[PDB]
């Protein structure tokens, strides 16, 4: 049996700037049980039709997870630009996989403001496909040296989403699992 049940129900989920990935092999996939669940609100499949998934079997599969806002769910797709798909996580233009996204206004809806999930704001160049950078050195905005001191023209290169219990539908948190098939 596959470990799918573990990634879809784990008690902890990483933020988007340090997204974890898992590799799964030697299991019997059961896309069926997830082919009818109504919990998922955005079950998009790119490259391969979702119905024929069960018949064919592959060698190696990868699963990645993020917690993202309501608006940026559409940005997890090939050939898209924005504040998230270009500096934090980008997909190859020849993507062949699935992007499951569901609502998490119960587990992750902190009371009084969470301020624990952060996304990357400032950088210097775009991101190659499947590129992760956990480093958090101080970013500079001018020729003046910054020597690791926060201040004018010296900004921390992260921002904290503000998830709350009464936010609108467009800003409520969503959890995304992207499956990539080699």
């Amino acid at each position: 049996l596959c470990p799918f049940g573990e990634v879809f129900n784990a008690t902890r989920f990483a933020s988007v700037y340090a997204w974890n990935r898992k590799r799964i092999s030697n299991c019997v996939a059961d896309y069926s049980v997830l082919y009818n669940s109504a919990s998922f609100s955005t079950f998009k499949c790119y490259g391969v039709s979702p119905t024929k998934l069960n018949d064919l079997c592959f060698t190696n599969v990868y699963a990645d997870s993020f917690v993202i806002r309501g608006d940026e769910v559409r940005q997890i797709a090939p050939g898209q630009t924005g504040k998230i798909a270009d500096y934090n996580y980008k997909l190859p233009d020849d993507f062949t996989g699935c992007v499951i996204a569901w609502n998490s206004n119960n587990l992750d809806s902190k009371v009084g403001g969470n301020y624990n999930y952060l996304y990357r704001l400032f950088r210097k160049s775009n991101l190659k496909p499947f590129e992760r950078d956990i480093s958090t050195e101080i970013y500079q905005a001018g020729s003046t040296p910054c020597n690791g001191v926060e201040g004018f023209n010296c900004y921390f290169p992260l921002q904290s989403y503000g998830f709350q219990p009464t936010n609108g539908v467009g800003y409520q948190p969503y959890r995304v699992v992207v499956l990539s098939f080699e």
């Epitope: 630009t81 400032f122 775009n126 467009g170």
Partner: antibody, heavy 110, light 106 residues
């Protein structure tokens, strides 16, 4: 600080290259905004360029102007192509998303 | 998203408290900026994210509101504060400005 230049009159259908010169600020590392204003009317958005090179234009003026950056002189350039009579307005060059500083301003008329 | 200012001109005396309302269609959670523009000058940012105050402006200026309606409050009016104020949506492109409100002293 910033500075604009190239303001004046141009015959309908022409083109121009407005220059925004920046000092103390590296143009290759911040979000940049280009905002226009009609004479006596309210502000309207025109263009934005991201640090990574992505660029967004306004919905009503899409496909006629082009913004670019030059690191050798540290400048921002905007090239308008295929103008019209109502295109006349005062444009500006500003920094966004941390510590907004708005430059003095140029005038472009038909 | 169509930001709107129902009012267009409010007058008061020196030392009075003045409020300005800016409404937004659909919903913007906490994304709005208050811009001030003096006659014949370049506009300067006053309040970002509708609750945090910028450095340099006196503390007597304040902002509040959320969801659909936002408000800008001046506690003590000053003789040299005649200007035009705008509210701008600044979450994700495009960024649509408002109509503007002109303050008059008497």
């Amino acid at each position: 600080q910033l500075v604009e230049s190239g303001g004046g009159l141009v015959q309908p259908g022409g083109s121009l290259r407005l220059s925004c010169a920046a000092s103390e600020i590296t143009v290759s590392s911040n979000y940049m905004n280009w905002v226009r204003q009609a004479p006596g009317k309210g502000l309207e958005w025109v263009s934005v360029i991201y640090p990574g090179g992505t660029t967004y234009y306004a919905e009503s003026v899409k496909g006629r102007f082009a913004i670019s950056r030059d690191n050798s002189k540290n400048t921002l350039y905007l090239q308008m192509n295929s103008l019209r009579p109502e295109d006349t307005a005062v444009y500006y060059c500003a920094r966004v998303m941390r510590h907004e500083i708005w430059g003095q301003g140029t005038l472009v008329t038909v | 998203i169509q930001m709107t200012q129902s009012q267009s001109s409010l007058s008061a005396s020196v030392g009075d408290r003045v409020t300005i309302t800016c409404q937004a269609s659909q919903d913007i959670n906490n994304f709005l900026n208050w811009y001030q523009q003096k006659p014949g000058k370049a506009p300067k940012l006053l309040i970002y994210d509708a609750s945090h105050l910028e450095t340099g402006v006196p503390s007597r200026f304040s902002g509040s509101g959320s969801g659909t309606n936002f408000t800008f409050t001046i506690s003590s009016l000053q003789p040299e504060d005649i200007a035009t104020y705008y509210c701008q949506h600044c979450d994700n492109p495009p960024y649509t400005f408002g109509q503007g409100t002109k303050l008059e002293i008497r």
